[PDB]
Design goal:
This is part of a larger assembly, with chains A (about 55 residues), B (about 120 residues), C (about 60 residues) and D (about 120 residues). Chain A has about 55 residues and is of the alpha+beta class. Chain A has one helix at about 10-15; strands at about 30, 35, 45-50, 50. With about 120 residues, chain D is mostly beta strands. In chain D, the strands form two sheets. A five-stranded mixed beta barrel of chain D has the order 1-2-3-4-7. Classes of the chains: A alpha+beta (about 55), B alpha+beta (about 120), C mainly alpha (about 60), D mainly beta (about 120). The interface of A and B includes residues 38, 41, 42 and 53 of A. The structure holds magnesium ion (MG) (2 copies). The site of one magnesium ion has 3 residues of chain A, from loops. The structure holds five RNA strands.
Chain lengths: ~55, ~120, ~60, ~120
RNA sequence: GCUCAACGGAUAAAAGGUACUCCGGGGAUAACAGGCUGAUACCGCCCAAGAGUUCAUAUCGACGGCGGUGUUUGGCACCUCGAUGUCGGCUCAUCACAUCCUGGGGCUGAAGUAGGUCCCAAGGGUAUGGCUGUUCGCCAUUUAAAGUGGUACGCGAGCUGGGUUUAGAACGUCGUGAGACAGUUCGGUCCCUAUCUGCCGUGGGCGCUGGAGAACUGAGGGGGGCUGCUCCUAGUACGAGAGGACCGGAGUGGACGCAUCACUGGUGUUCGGGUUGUCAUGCCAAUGGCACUGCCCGGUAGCUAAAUGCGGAAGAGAUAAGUGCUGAAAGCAUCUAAGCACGAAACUUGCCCCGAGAUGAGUUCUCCCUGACCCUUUAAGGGUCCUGAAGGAACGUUGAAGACGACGACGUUGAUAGGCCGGGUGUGUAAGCGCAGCGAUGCGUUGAGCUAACCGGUACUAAUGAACCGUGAGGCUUAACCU
RNA sequence: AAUUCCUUGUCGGGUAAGUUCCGACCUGCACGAAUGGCGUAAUGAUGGCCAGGCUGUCUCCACCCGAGACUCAGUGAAAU
RNA sequence: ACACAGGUGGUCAGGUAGAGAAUACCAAGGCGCUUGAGAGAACUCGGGUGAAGGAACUAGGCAAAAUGGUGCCGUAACUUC
RNA sequence: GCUCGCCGGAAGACCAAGGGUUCCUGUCCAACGUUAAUCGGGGCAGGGUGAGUCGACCCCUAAGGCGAGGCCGAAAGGCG
RNA sequence: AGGACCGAACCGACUAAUGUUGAAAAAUUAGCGGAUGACUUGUGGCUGGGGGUGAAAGGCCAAUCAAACCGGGAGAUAGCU
């Protein structure tokens, strides 16, 4: 229900051990607008797989 | 478990899943491309990719499921008059999915759904 | 066995209630008079004995 | 599949009308029994003068089940009435004589060659 | 001048109730539970008066005697009163052996059948209801049997709250009374989101001394083990008959557990039909929304049991009790002492599952890497420029895989999903058009129309070029070979 | 007996089985006549007992519909 | 003590169905209630359906299930009529 | 803006009571708002309430309250 | 005609699940009883603590009642922790 002792801050490191983030490995570069974007996602400009998939 | 099943609850009851794809498919036919979330595109691949099966071929009696879960007849007048003859030879796959970043206020994964022959 | 007098853990958590029966005839005899079971068992020894003298008597 | 507390009808001319199973027999911890089976029953309703009496405790064989008995083709045989034929407690033979309604082929045995010979209809 | 007699004498002078209650404190002191103790209790043993026709010792055992158990009632007041929640039930249990069923024996006042008692044996099995807060018990009807105990007389941060044990109320009863009753009867709030330990699952890290992909071996651990009934042997042995077996064999059950959806069903709010009231679609005709899915009627896939397949072994070893064989000590006798055989659901195996973080990190099988230099505290050294393999992860499509993770399938060469065609499937003969009928409605097209998860196909869409990660022949020591 | 200890009194009924209930029995432990007695139609979110109907109460649980739990963002306590 | 599922008096009375100011669906009118978005395990909270059985459950048919309107027929004991 | 959903003898309109700028515009997003907020009953700055007939005041009076004197009471005061 | 009948508002609170760091220092959801009177509800008025009031239970008197609250005696007193 509730603890009987104060937990050690070293345990607090061990509980937060697996709690770390994870960044992106590599960004998919466009081949026409020539810019990095998310793999299997469109660019910021509206490009995907080279072509202009959406006029913004 | 949901072995061999098919259907996402979408955290909504079935009467609202009914009534939401009314307007969502009801406006995609209008503007030919819209911004929605990706599970409301991926469950909508069980919905809108069959809601273009709605858009196959004109009779008189085929004006009616496109009244039924749509409450609309103007969009009926767009489908079999213009879009039926548009997609006259495509045997499936009338759409395309564009995962377009995340929604601001809740980090919801958005996407663009659209038609294949938009231009 | 236990009696079901009022008091609880003085009553129900002890074996203050006795029952003495007969092997060849089958004549039970209980007692729950005082708190002690030997104020009951030995009393139920007397009451079965009081039945026992009547067994020849009621028959005859 | 008849458990306790189950009202059954009567299939012979014994005299009872309503019986009720109080014990499933024939096996250790045997929770259920279908046709071809023996149950201890009481009698809840009888005719004003018959072979029986309201409250007699005796055995019976189960002959018609609403639940169903299967055959090796896959065909399951259900009924619309749950009736039984009353037996002796000791000789364990049927007491009545005139069998009412149809019965099944699972009922036939050396113990029950007697009933099917008196049955009006055997499937 | 005081039974100031509670007699070193609180006052000349003083009774109660409090479950409406309250403070101050106490484990210095009660009630449960633990503790010690074992009187009592329970369970054995010794003696043998005798009973048992005779015959103590088949069965029993007077009078007495000696122990064991902690298990009854107790004793004690050591833990706990700045809290250790108790009766019964329910849910789950697990242990003991002083064994209820099953197993193995010995003796019998054991013809058989059936028992009696004793010993071995704890693998597995070991009722439902009526009564009552129940426990217990009685009873009914089962069963192979309805074991007994340890467990805070197991289990309330799991449930129940009937009983006891608050305040309300009443009777009987007691007291003048307020009130009280191991007297009843009616009514009467069961809190807690889990840090740790423990347990059930499922991951991450690093390790196993080049790296990677696999197959395993199996240390060790777990699961599992019940039984009736019928028939044969056989009316055989036995017995005068009645009755009725051993052993061996077959069949079918019960109960349990695993697997499963072909069947038989349930469910199937996403398939379909019927129908009520209303609202809207200009209006009819049609639909649709809402009314618990509005109310029904049904049904695919899936999931499911009441649906159907297995499962308990046989076998081996070593034995328990027990039976022996040779055989001295002990010219005989003698299962023991030397030797030696048999002997049970216990044991170890045989059965399945887990399993090399088995640090003791094992085994075999396959793939990858044969670039350059500086430094000084010169080595399992540090750094720099080329190189980036096997493969890996990441990302996307996904799953009869899943809380997440992990697992599995697939990423254009491609059937991974979705879509599409084909098919089946199921509601049950659509709409519109005719036709008849005053009409409601019926008939013609008509298993038509529709069709969720499904079966066969189809690249139609969505599964991206890359990049990332991991590198560049792998310590020392002898040893053995080869040169 | 809302009163009876003994006491699950005895008998009858009721049930397969009834420590309950309903009839008697009077042995009233310790009823009793305005702290009224006995009876009483109607009445009762009143007490007990029995039946029919009814059904996941139960045997013996299965399946879906939602709301959380779990995943990700934003925020962000508590007793101890 | 909160932008608190509470409490607070008077006045107002549209349509259809309906005895009705019940209920339903609505008009006028007003809102979608201050975290979302996923996933579709146990597990509770709510719900729906259920083979065969029908109180055996349990302290106790607790809750659920069921009954349900308008006419008409018919209706016992007993009564203080 | 488009549908969709809910309420509708109210989740609509209207007052008293009570609140006392919340009202209307401009501006701002630190805090406040159980998240963001470009928004706000938030901050900031401006506006905005017009009466012979409506309400109060006012004229009456109830329950009542007070009370000249008056009565009573150590005093304070009580009653009227 | 009725301390009549069924039953809205209204008024009460009998059962059950909830909830028990709550939506809420007693509420919701489902039901339930009363619902022309011993009714219910506004606006006021009055009764004050050994007093009030009470179809009475030691009930209620500003979330507190077997002697209200606030101030003072008062640093009550404590052989107790
Ligand atoms: Mg942490
Ligand atoms: Mg002995």
């Amino acid at each position: 229900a509730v603890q009987q002792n104060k937990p050690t801050r070293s345990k607090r490191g061990m509980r937060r051990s697996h709690d770390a983030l994870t960044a992106v490995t590599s960004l998919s570069v466009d081949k026409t607008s020539g810019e990095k974007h998310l793999r299997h996602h469109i660019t910021a400009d509206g490009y995907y797989r080279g072509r202009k998939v959406i006029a913004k | 478990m949901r072995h061999r099943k098919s259907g996402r609850q979408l955290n909504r009851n079935s009467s609202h899943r009914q009534a939401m794809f009314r307007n969502m498919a009801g406006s995609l036919v209008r503007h030919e491309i819209i911004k929605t979330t990706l599970p409301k595109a991926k469950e909508l691949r069980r919905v809108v990719e069959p809601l273009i099966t709605l858009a196959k071929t004109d009779s008189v009696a085929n004006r009616r499921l496109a009244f039924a879960r749509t409450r609309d007849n103007e969009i009926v007048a767009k489908l079999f008059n213009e879009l039926g003859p548009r997609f006259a030879s495509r045997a499936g796959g009338y759409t395309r999915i564009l995962k377009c970043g995340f929604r601001a206020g809740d980090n919801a994964p958005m996407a663009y759904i659209e038609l294949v022959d938009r231009s | 066995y236990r009696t079901s007098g009022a008091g609880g853990q003085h009553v129900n958590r002890t074996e203050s209630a006795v029952r003495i029966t007969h092997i060849p005839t089958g004549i039970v005899t209980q007692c729950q008079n005082d708190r002690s079971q030997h104020k009951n068992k030995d009393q139920a020894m007397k009451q079965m004995k009081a039945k026992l003298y009547e067994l020849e008597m009621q028959k005859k | 599949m008849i458990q306790e507390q189950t009202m059954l009808n009567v299939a012979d001319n014994s005299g009872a009308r309503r019986v009720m199973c109080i014990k499933v027999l024939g096996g250790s911890h045997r929770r259920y029994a279908g046709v071809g089976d023996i149950i201890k029953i009481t009698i809840k309703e009888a005719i004003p003068r018959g072979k029986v009496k309201k409250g007699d405790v005796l055995k019976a064989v189960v002959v018609r089940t609403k639940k169903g008995v299967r055959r090796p083709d896959g065909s399951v045989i259900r009924f619309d009435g749950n009736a039984c034929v009353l037996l002796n407690n000791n000789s364990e033979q049927p007491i009545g004589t005139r069998i009412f309604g149809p019965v099944t082929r699972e009922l036939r045995s050396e113990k029950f060659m007697k009933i099917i010979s008196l049955a009006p209809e055997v499937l």
